[PDB]
């Protein structure tokens, strides 16, 4: 069944699951040709595969060479995504393989279902949620590793930094989705909020600044203000 507000808490139970987002797999700049036609040039992308309970992020970098000489790239991207996700499952020890995989876009259901035929006990689910995972390329260290890659590469991150030492995975996921939603609705302002204070740094082994509990409350507040506003600035309210 689909994942929605009603069954939100299932994400943080003890059944291994993964979110799969394919939004940033196939990325193009569109440009004009000398003849005045339009062409696309691909840039590196990534598959965003996340354990919402542990914060473990399997960032599969999609090097532009994988598109070379291929047709219908938007459709291939979904299949490529499905192949990498299934290769990932297969590489994990049995006790680490997900019992569920949740795709953020329904067009991934059939490609993933076909690639996972060897795993009939892994439920492939869509969601009704409008999750902001596309904004993961707004996270500087993730964007940096993607853009610098010269070959296919898998990079492993904990998208929650050390937060699970102090908060539950429900709150960590809620923080993450709040940050990513802010970065998606107004990336400049979201980044201004995260770095306004020169004294709060990002540890070399982290993605997000080292905020105290009190500072995270202020920060989270500032991100909610931004999201409400930009909704206003958009809808004039």
């Amino acid at each position: 069944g689909a994942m929605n507000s009603s069954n939100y808490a299932e994400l943080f139970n003890n059944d291994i699951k993964l979110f799969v987002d394919d939004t940033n797999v196939y990325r193009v700049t569109v440009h004009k040709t000398f003849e005045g036609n339009v062409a696309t040039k691909a840039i590196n992308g990534c598959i965003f595969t996340l354990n919402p309970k542990t914060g473990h992020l399997f960032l599969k970098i999609i090097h532009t060479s994988v598109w070379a000489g291929q047709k219908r790239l938007s459709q291939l991207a979904k299949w490529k995504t499905a192949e990498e996700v299934s290769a990932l499952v297969r590489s994990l020890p049995k006790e680490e393989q997900p019992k569920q995989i949740i795709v953020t876009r329904k067009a991934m259901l059939d490609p993933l279902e076909v690639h996972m035929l060897d795993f009939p006990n892994i439920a492939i689910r869509p969601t009704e949620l409008r999750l902001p995972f596309s904004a993961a390329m707004s996270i500087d260290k993730l964007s940096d590793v993607v853009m610098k890659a010269t070959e296919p590469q898998m990079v492993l991150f904990n998208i929650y930094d050390d937060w699970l030492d102090r908060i539950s995975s429900y709150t960590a996921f809620s923080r993450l989705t709040l940050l990513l939603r802010a970065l998606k609705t107004n990336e400049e302002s979201a980044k201004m909020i995260l770095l306004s204070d020169p004294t709060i740094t990002i540890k070399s082994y982290h993605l997000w600044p080292s905020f105290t509990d009190e500072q995270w409350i202020t920060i989270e507040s500032q991100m909610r203000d931004l999201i409400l506003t930009e909704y206003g600035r958009k809808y004039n309210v």
């Binding site: 291939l76 299949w79 192949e83 059939d110 490609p111 279902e113 076909v114 690639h115 035929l117 060897d118």
Partner: protein, 300 residues
């Protein structure tokens, strides 16, 4: 020309013989059907006046024996049986034919409808889908479910059609996932035609049998099978040219013969719009497309 004689008609019933049908009143002096064309399978089917629930009927070929119908008042249906005494049967049919107590299979000479709907249907294949080996004829009814249906409950009463499942290992070669899911030619030509059906005639035979069970009995799994076999061909980029041409003729007559007031349930919108307008073979079914557009433009 052969004969399906009846012992009597004790309950009011609409009797169907192939694509024809006629009403028999309770205890009317009706003793059966004569002049049945040799060389084709046939189906004789029933819908009781009292309980329109359960259309049921018998597939049979008169070359395979002498068959008659007798109402069973315990099981409450018209049962087909084989008269194993050739003399008793010839005499009885003659007696009936003399008293003119039989309706004539009402075939117009210009009319090739039945041949065209049963071109590739063979009684021997029917008997492997409908497993009841002690009889030469095969019972079907509205409620029988398919093997594939039961997988997703009484095995002896199933329709053992060939299982087609687009999201299965059988359909999908490891390492050809996208290729095989978007272009089913592998699954059609190697797995099914060469592997399971052996030739296109056996494939078309089952397809035509599925349709006929769907139309005559409203059998839902039969309709599912019909559409699946159509969709496997239409979604294959590589089909022998002879199969496409024959498919267009096949489907044309199925659509021509469908009762107009049953198209809403028997025809799957998704399959037909995909097949006629999106699929590899979108251009290869000119007759079927033209009849479908002039007769059911709503569905599309």
């Amino acid at each position: 020309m052969n004969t399906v004689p009846f012992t009597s008609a004790p309950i009011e019933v609409t009797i169907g013989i192939d694509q024809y049908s006629f009403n028999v009143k309770e205890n009317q002096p009706f003793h059966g059907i004569k002049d049945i064309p040799i060389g084709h399978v046939h189906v004789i089917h029933f819908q009781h006046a009292d309980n329109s629930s359960m259309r049921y009927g018998y597939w049979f070929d008169c070359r395979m024996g002498n068959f008659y119908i007798q109402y069973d008042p315990k099981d409450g249906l018209y049962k087909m049986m084989e008269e194993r005494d050739g003399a008793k049967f010839e005499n009885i049919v003659h007696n009936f034919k003399e008293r003119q107590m039989m309706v004539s299979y009402p075939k117009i000479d210009e009319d090739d409808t039945w041949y065209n709907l049963t071109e590739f249907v063979q009684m021997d294949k029917i008997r492997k889908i409908v497993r009841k080996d002690e009889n030469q004829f095969s019972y079907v009814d509205s409620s029988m479910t398919t093997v594939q249906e039961n997988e997703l409950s009484d095995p002896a009463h199933s329709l053992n059609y060939t299982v087609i499942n687009f999201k299965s290992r059988e359909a999908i070669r490891p390492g050809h996932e996208m290729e095989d899911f978007l272009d089913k030619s592998y699954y059609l030509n190697t797995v099914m035609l060469q592997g399971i059906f052996k030739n296109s005639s056996n494939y078309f035979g089952e397809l035509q049998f599925a349709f006929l069970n769907a139309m005559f009995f409203g059998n839902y799994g039969s309709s599912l099978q019909w559409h699946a076999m159509i969709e496997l061909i239409c979604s294959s980029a590589t089909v022998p040219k002879h199969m496409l041409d024959k498919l267009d003729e096949i489907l044309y007559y199925q659509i021509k013969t469908l009762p107009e007031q049953y198209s809403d349930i028997l025809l799957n919108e998704r399959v037909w719009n995909i097949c006629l307008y999106s699929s590899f073979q979108k251009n290869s079914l000119h007759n079927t497309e033209k009849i479908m557009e002039n007769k059911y433009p709503e569905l599309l």
